[PDB]
Structure 1
Amino acid sequence: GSRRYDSRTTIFSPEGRLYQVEYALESISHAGTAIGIMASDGIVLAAERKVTSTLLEQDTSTEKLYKLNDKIAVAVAGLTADAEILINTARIHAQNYLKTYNEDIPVEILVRRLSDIKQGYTQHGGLRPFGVSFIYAGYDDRYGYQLYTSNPSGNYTGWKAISVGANTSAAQTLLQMDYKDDMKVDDAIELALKTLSKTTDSSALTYDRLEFATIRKGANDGEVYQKIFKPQEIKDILVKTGIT
């Protein structure tokens, strides 16, 4: 009698969706709020860190911004233990394609290989599926800039602007009315900054606790250049926007 569902995750839940995935969604809401925006001139990525006060040095250490390549970039919102495994794994798969084919790996193929890892845990064995959500920002020579979202269920969908954490549906509403096809790099910086302030309980969002990164097409020869903005440069962003 019974003696099931307590070990292997292959047994389906009474609702048809595994309760382990539902509990992973709650861990995503406990993390920060990362809002990506896909545009023709680049992709803007910004998030608010969990650590606080004055004790932790927030200038050097960034857990929500990781660079896979000079084009593809990821935004980590979720559990760090499950995220670190795919960080080195994606770097291996991206360099193997660059080793074998000598080309930049597309986001659709790269995420598909990473999506099967989260799916393989719910497929074979009772291993824990990754409940961390990745925001994939990359550029290709065919479809241009591609922006997807990694769900703990193991799938991914295309998104122009996606938000995680608290107020997920509320952030997508503010970005819809402010969405523009002619939006430049600077136009996406201010609207993403004002939306993040309203969707979070902390309106302060200093320079150290907030991480800001933007891929720009206006570099030399139109090449993709990823510039990591230090908190010293983030402080100047609040002066231009007039919030702080």
Structure 2
Amino acid sequence: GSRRYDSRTTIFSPEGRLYQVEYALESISHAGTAIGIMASDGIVLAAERKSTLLEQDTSTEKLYKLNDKIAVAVAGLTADAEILINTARIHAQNYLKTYNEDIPVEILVRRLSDIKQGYTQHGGLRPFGVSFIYAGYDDRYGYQLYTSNPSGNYTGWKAISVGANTSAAQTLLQMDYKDDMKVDDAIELALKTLSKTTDSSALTYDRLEFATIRKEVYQKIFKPQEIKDILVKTGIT
């Protein structure tokens, strides 16, 4: 039978851990860094891309809109992330169809994390190798910044980073984050944290994906020219 070839993805380690989830987290730890900063007047999503001939102006590989008020930063396998993002968009539209209201951020994050957890407990399939950063606004809590990992755990944050060099980025955020910064200050902080955590020698606009949510709420995924301008003004250039 096939019993010989089964890897037994959804089993515990003797230490109580799940091997495949930890290995997926290890996979994400080598993905490009994504940072989310929740300021007083909005949220900032910044992601570092990970060639000259690459069509950078067209590439949208780390920042995705799920809604008119919710966006995700992606660290890990992009195709698994595309699957999950399609499911999240459909779920948000289902909520809007059912209740005539925009889905709360936490409900959407919880549904996505439940999908992630389902692959961890049954079915015999490998987990999604994706970590998300959800930046969203709703009338209940306002600006909210969540993160989720392959295990299906989701937590709310004021500032959070996923991907490579999460420890260093989180140390910088802890050092420099204030509760009362504005969106511009949060943008500056995100750029500085990405510059001091990138593995490359310099941080340039072609290596960056940027998005903000500001108040009605307005999602803006930055164009390369706008990223260039924000790089010049911040001083990284």
Q: TM-score range by the shorter chain?
A: over 0.9
Q: How far 1:182 sits from its partner (Å)?
A: 2.1
For residues 176 and 11 of structure 1, the distance between their equivalents in structure 2, rounded to whole angstroms, comes to 35
Secondary structure at the counterpart of residue 10 of structure 2: coil
Q: How far 1:41 sits from its partner (Å)?
A: 0.5
TM-score (norm 1): 0.91
Secondary structure at the counterpart of residue 75 of structure 1: strand
Secondary structure at the counterpart of residue 176 of structure 1: helix
Structure 1 residues 47 and 186 mapped into 2: Cα distance closer, same or farther (>3 Å)? same
For residues 26 and 98 of structure 2, the distance between their equivalents in structure 1, rounded to whole angstroms, comes to 40
Q: How far 1:81 sits from its partner (Å)?
A: 2.4
Q: How far 1:3 sits from its partner (Å)?
A: 6.7
Q: Deviations over 1:58-84 (max 9, x none)?
A: 112211011111101111111112212
**Gaps (5+ residues) in structure 1?**
218-222
% identical equivalent positions: 100
TM-score (norm 2): 0.94
Q: How far 1:5 sits from its partner (Å)?
A: 9.4
Structure 1 residues 241 and 11 mapped into 2: Cα distance closer, same or farther (>3 Å)? closer
State the number of aligned residues: 237
Match of 2:232 in 1: 239
State whether residues 138 and 145 of structure 1, in contact with CA within 8 Å, keep that contact through their aligned partners in structure 2. yes
Structure 1 residues 176 and 211 mapped into 2: Cα distance closer, same or farther (>3 Å)? same
Structure 1 residues 97 and 201 mapped into 2: Cα distance closer, same or farther (>3 Å)? same
Q: Deviations over 1:113-142 (max 9, x none)?
A: 111111112222101211200111100111
For residues 150 and 121 of structure 1, the distance between their equivalents in structure 2, rounded to whole angstroms, comes to 14
Q: Deviations over 1:146-176 (max 9, x none)?
A: 1111111111011110011222122112112
For residues 39 and 6 of structure 1, the distance between their equivalents in structure 2, rounded to whole angstroms, comes to 47
For residues 18 and 8 of structure 1, the distance between their equivalents in structure 2, rounded to whole angstroms, comes to 10
Secondary structure at the counterpart of residue 37 of structure 2: strand
Q: How far 1:32 sits from its partner (Å)?
A: 0.4
**Gaps (5+ residues) in structure 2?**
none
For residues 156 and 40 of structure 2, the distance between their equivalents in structure 1, rounded to whole angstroms, comes to 15
Match of 1:57 in 2: 55
- CA-atom RMSD in angstroms: 2.0
Secondary structure at the counterpart of residue 99 of structure 1: helix
For residues 201 and 188 of structure 2, the distance between their equivalents in structure 1, rounded to whole angstroms, comes to 14
